[PDB]
């Protein structure tokens, strides 16, 4: 994610700032930082702002600029062509960009949001069923990082501290049992109810960094100010309320609504069990730990060897230490390439099949097949252009194109109306 | 905060008068009739005429400050019928729809203990 931070200026910019002290008459330039610090911690010519903004944000701004193509654009400094193309398909997968590269109605909004397009998608959909106080809390935690300390890092594994760590890790996930971002949501929210005087003790009990939460607490107020700005027409009138920051526990329906919030911003970083997509291709059983159980993203390229595609879950994730068979579709913030034997996945939450198609209907990843003919599978044709029927959707890559590797979603009822010779998805019935 | 008017309703065979005044009755606040709001004589007494007249005064009533009215409906009385006709009720119905609070409803038709001979004669009238 991109953030605005206080940082040391360049040498030349500092030298210019010295100049105007002397421009009127010979002047004395004073620097709070020392000369020896000046040589080391300052860069000699401030690095271009085009490099500072995310490449995806360059495209989204450019798509706010309705530019026909990023390569037709004339530019002083190059980002590589392919990444500029990866950004376009990236934004398209999020629903921000159309198949014709034109910036969608929501596509325009994420451009307005100063935040990253992936995180900006969270901002748009965050305000659903009073779940706004969370998606800021998750987003604040995601950007700042993980306040948690791993068991291996501490060195507790002494055995009594291991139990308290286990109890501490258990009480995180009483909110969500299969999800690792929502357990964290319970913690960042829990310390809010916690008194300030007793905070350090809970923060020792749960092995939480003193300084990282205060930024999160300071970060959530800023991000709520931004969402309350953008969402309402009164983008300056809205003021940050600590009671708005205050949140009430979710319902099980809200959790499911929250799960699809997690998938909206990271729709590309979603993986199914490798055994589910290829049953019996790779030997898997309950004895094999969740480290051993493989996964494969829909967007990932198919490889000559299946194990190359295979990705695996982290041990620190609760879903590993539950001891139960994990859900079919799992979703991660980032792929951690560490570990030649197995590639480590940090997964946020478990997304179900049809709700995954819900993030797919906003996005362009979904591919819908033709209506089927069978017992009780007839199609309603109210008018010549609209029809109701069941269609099997294929997420990401289709069956015909074998370059990628994707998974097929179960058929579910849908309304289809013809536009331009193809029937768009009006709403899943 | 509640100022009270007096909506006097006179429902005749051939016309309906909606009359709003102060509690004393000395000062008139607004006057409309079926003849005001219709294009033909035959429909002066129609219930439709009564509703339009009642709505007109009620909008005027909310202008002046009056928010409630006491209704004293009446008929022609005298040597003729003693009960208000459908135009009278329809005017009462519209006043409720205008939103003005209705305080009290009474019939004040003139009821003679003794009446002069009617105009009909021996055989009768209203054939």
């Amino acid at each position: 994610v991109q953030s605005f931070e206080v940082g040391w200026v360049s040498k030349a910019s500092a030298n210019q700032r010295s100049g105007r002290a002397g421009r009127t008459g010979p002047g004395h330039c004073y620097r709070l930082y020392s000369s020896a610090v000046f040589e080391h911690d300052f860069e000699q010519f401030s690095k271009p702002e085009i490099l500072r903004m995310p490449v995806e944000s360059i495209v989204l701004q450019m798509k706010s600029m309705a530019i026909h193509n990023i390569i037709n654009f004339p530019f002083p400094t190059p980002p590589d062509r392919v990444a500029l193309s990866k950004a376009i398909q990236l934004l398209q997968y999020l629903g921000a960009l159309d198949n014709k590269e034109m910036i969608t109605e929501d596509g325009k909004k994420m451009s307005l949001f100063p935040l990253s397009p992936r995180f900006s998608k969270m901002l748009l959909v965050s305000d659903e069923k009073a779940c706004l106080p969370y998606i800021v809390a998750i987003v604040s935690a995601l950007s700042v990082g993980d306040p948690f300390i791993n068991e291996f890092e501490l060195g507790i594994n002494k055995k009594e501290l291991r139990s308290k760590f286990y109890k501490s890790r258990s009480q995180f996930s009483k909110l969500d049992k299969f999800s690792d971002v929502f357990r964290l949501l319970s913690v960042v929210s829990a310390m809010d109810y916690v008194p300030k005087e007793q905070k350090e003790i809970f923060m020792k009990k749960n092995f939480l960094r003193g300084k990282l939460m205060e930024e999160i607490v300071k970060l959530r107020k800023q991000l709520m100010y931004i969402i309350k700005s953008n969402t309402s027409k009164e983008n300056i009138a809205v003021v940050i309320r600590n009671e708005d920051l205050k949140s009430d526990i979710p319902s099980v329906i809200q959790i499911k609504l929250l799960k699809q919030m997690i998938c909206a911003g990271f729709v590309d970083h979603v993986a199914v069990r490798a055994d589910v997509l290829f049953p019996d291709d790779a030997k898997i059983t309950n004895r094999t730990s969740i480290i051993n159980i493989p996964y494969i993203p829909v967007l990932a390229t198919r490889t000559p060897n299946i194990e190359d595609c295979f990705v695996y879950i982290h041990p620190t994730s609760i879903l590993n230490n539950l001891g139960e068979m994990p859900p079919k579709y799992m979703l991660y913030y980032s792929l951690h390439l560490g570990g030649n034997n197995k590639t480590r996945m940090n997964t946020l939450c478990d997304i179900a099949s049809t709700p995954l198609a819900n993030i797919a209907r906003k996005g362009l990843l979904l591919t819908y097949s033709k209506p089927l003919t069978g017992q009780g599978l007839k199609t309603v044709n109210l008018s010549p252009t609209e029809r109701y029927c069941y269609v099997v959707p294929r997420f990401g890559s289709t069956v015909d194109n074998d370059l990628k590797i994707g998974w097929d979603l179960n058929p579910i009822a849908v309304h289809q109306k013809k536009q331009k010779g193809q029937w768009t998805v009006i709403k899943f019935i | 905060s509640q100022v009270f008017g007096v909506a006097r309703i006179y429902a005749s065979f051939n016309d309906t008068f909606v009359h709003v005044t102060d509690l004393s009755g000395k000062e008139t606040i607004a006057r409309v009739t079926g003849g005001m709001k219709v294009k033909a004589d035959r429909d002066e007494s129609s219930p439709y005429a009564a509703m339009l007249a009642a709505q007109d005064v009620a909008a005027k009533c909310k202008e002046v400050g009056i928010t409630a009215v006491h209704v004293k409906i009446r008929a022609t009385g005298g040597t003729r019928t003693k009960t208000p006709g459908p135009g009278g009720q329809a005017a009462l119905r519209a006043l409720a729809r205008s939103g003005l609070r209705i305080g009290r409803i009474e019939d004040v038709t003139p009821v003679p203990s003794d009446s002069t001979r009617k105009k009909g004669g021996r055989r009768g009238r209203r054939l």
Binding site: V6, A12, Q16, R17, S18, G19, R20, A21, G22, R23, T24, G25, P26, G27, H28, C29, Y30, R31, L32, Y33, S34, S35, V37, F38, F45, S46, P48, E49, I50, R52, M53, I58, Q61, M62, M65, A66, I67, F73, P74, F75, P76, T77 | -
Partner: protein
Amino acid sequence: IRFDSTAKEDTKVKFMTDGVLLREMMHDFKLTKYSSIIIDEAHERNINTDILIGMLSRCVRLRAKLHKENPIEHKKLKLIIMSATLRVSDFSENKTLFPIAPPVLQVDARQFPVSIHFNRRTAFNYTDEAFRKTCKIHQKLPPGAILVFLTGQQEITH
């Protein structure tokens, strides 16, 4: 200061931000209304200015092509760039900005030497020592306007 706001038709010189050009240029690709475009502060090389310098390089081709067809019918466009730094060479070398380098002009201002000073230790609470340091400036140095740099607006008012 604003996209939607419009200047009086009588004004013949216009002040605005790099972002506003994009939307005004979005409304009209030709920019026949603008005979020249003046780029300020290239040395920051801000992205919302970098996006601007690109499209303006695209539009000047059209005005050049339109000028080639008929100078009188279509008005030519001039492109002028200011940079406090002398390093516009990176702009010059780019082929996308143009095929061939145009002349680059330099003006040197009569500037008095600046004596350079540094504190012995950098201070974390830099706002406070700057305030004490600013007070020390008035105590010992003669009258003269003081220029200060704080990153945060609320710190400035503090």
